[PDB]
Each structure stands twice: as C-alpha cells, then as structure tokens.
C-alpha cells in the first residue's frame, strides 16, 4: 500500500514569532487515528498578546522568507471562510485560540476536516498561522470576512510536519 495512508498519523508544528514577536513560542501535536477519524490538536503557545487570535492553515508551506511575508487559507474545496464548526469553511479554518494576561494559550481542539493523510485536505507541509487579532468566523460583515475572517497580520507560524 503506502505507509502514508496507514495506522495512526502523528504530526507536529513548532510555532515561533520573529523580530518584535520573537518571544512567541509553542508547539502543537496533531493525531488522527484513521482516514475517517477526527484529528485531535493539543499544545500551548506562550508570549502572545492577551485576547483571541485566529488560527489558520495557509495554502503555502514556504518559510524561506520568514513568517511576515502565497497568501490564502488552505482551500482545496473552493469554499468561503467560516468557523471550524461551519460546513462552509476552508480546510485551514481552525477558528480562534485565546491567550490570557499570562500570554499563554492552551490549545485543545478536535477537527473533522483537516487530514494528516494525503487526501485533498492534507495539511502536512503547510504553515499554521497565529493571527494578530481574532477571526470573525465570516460573520463580521467586513469585505474580507468571507475571505479570511479579518484577523489581521501574522504573529507567529510553523510548518505542520511529521513527528
């Protein structure tokens, strides 16, 4: 067969900011037991400004020019931007994470759309982004609401890679 389509798949992302945001650091683990199965995401990020931050997988995995410079959420199904719980969403739409006054965000998410297996929703080799502000979940009535949730610039990112 192909070992990439087999057994449980474990992935990780090393999250880092740069420049003024060099203090932003964290790691996420992704586990999907089977092709049909949900993906569980767990980890922490530290050094974040207090409040909600959009968490998105973009269509590129290219970190050669750093975090702060293609744009577009991972969207192989050509849908509009939405919340993770919305049917009308990008593959890359993982919603919002929250950091308190400590700057620590605890991430514990379950997703049914992303894949750790090489199906069209494969997220490995793509960049996970933590945005400046909150994702409006396509409900904000901004022009870019249905494009990217109006979550502003990037604070930090990391490539989703195999464990």
Site for Cu ion, rule CB under 5 A: 56, 148
Nearer to a copy of itself, 17 or 138 (CB): 17
Tokens of 163: 């464990």
- From residue 40 to residue 79, the character string flagging contacts with a copy of itself as x (rule: CB under 8 A) and all else as - is --------------------xxxxx-----x-----x---
- CA nearest neighbour of 57 among 105, 116, 4, 140: 116
Nearer to Cu ion, 11 or 130 (CB): 130
What burial class does residue 17 get, using C-beta atoms within 10 Å of its C-beta: 0-12 exposed, 13-18 middle, 19+ buried? buried
Residue 112 interacts with Ca ion (CB under 5 A): yes or no: yes
- From residue 2 to residue 31, the character string flagging contacts with Zn ion as x (rule: CB under 5 A) and all else as - is ------------------------------
Residue 90 interacts with Zn ion (CB under 5 A): yes or no: yes
Is 21:157 a contact under the CB 8 Å cutoff?
A: no
> What DSSP character marks residue 85?
T
The contacts of residue 153 (CB under 8 Å, 6+ apart) are 68, 131, 132
Q: Is 111 annotated as a binding residue?
A: no
Residues comprising the binding site for Cu cation?
56, 73, 131
């Amino acid at each position: 067969v192909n070992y990439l389509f087999r057994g449980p798949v474990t992935a990780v992302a090393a999250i880092a900011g740069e420049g003024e945001h060099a203090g932003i650091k964290g790691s996420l683990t992704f586990l999907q037991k089977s092709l049909d199965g949900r993906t569980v995401i767990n980890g922490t990020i530290s050094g974040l400004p207090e409040g909600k931050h959009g968490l998105h997988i973009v269509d590129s995995g290219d970190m050669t020019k750093g975090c702060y410079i293609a744009k577009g959420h991972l969207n192989p199904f050509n849908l509009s931007h939405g919340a993770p719980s919305d049917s009308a969403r990008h593959v890359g739409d993982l919603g919002n994470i929250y950091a308190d006054d400590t700057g620590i965000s605890v991430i514990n998410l379950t997703d049914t759309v992303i894949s750790l297996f090489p199906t069209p929703a494969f997220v490995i080799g793509r960049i996970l982004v933590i945005h400046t502000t909150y994702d409006d979940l396509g409900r904000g009535g901004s022009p870019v609401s249905k494009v990217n949730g109006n979550a502003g610039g990037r604070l930090a990112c990391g490539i989703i890679s195999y464990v």
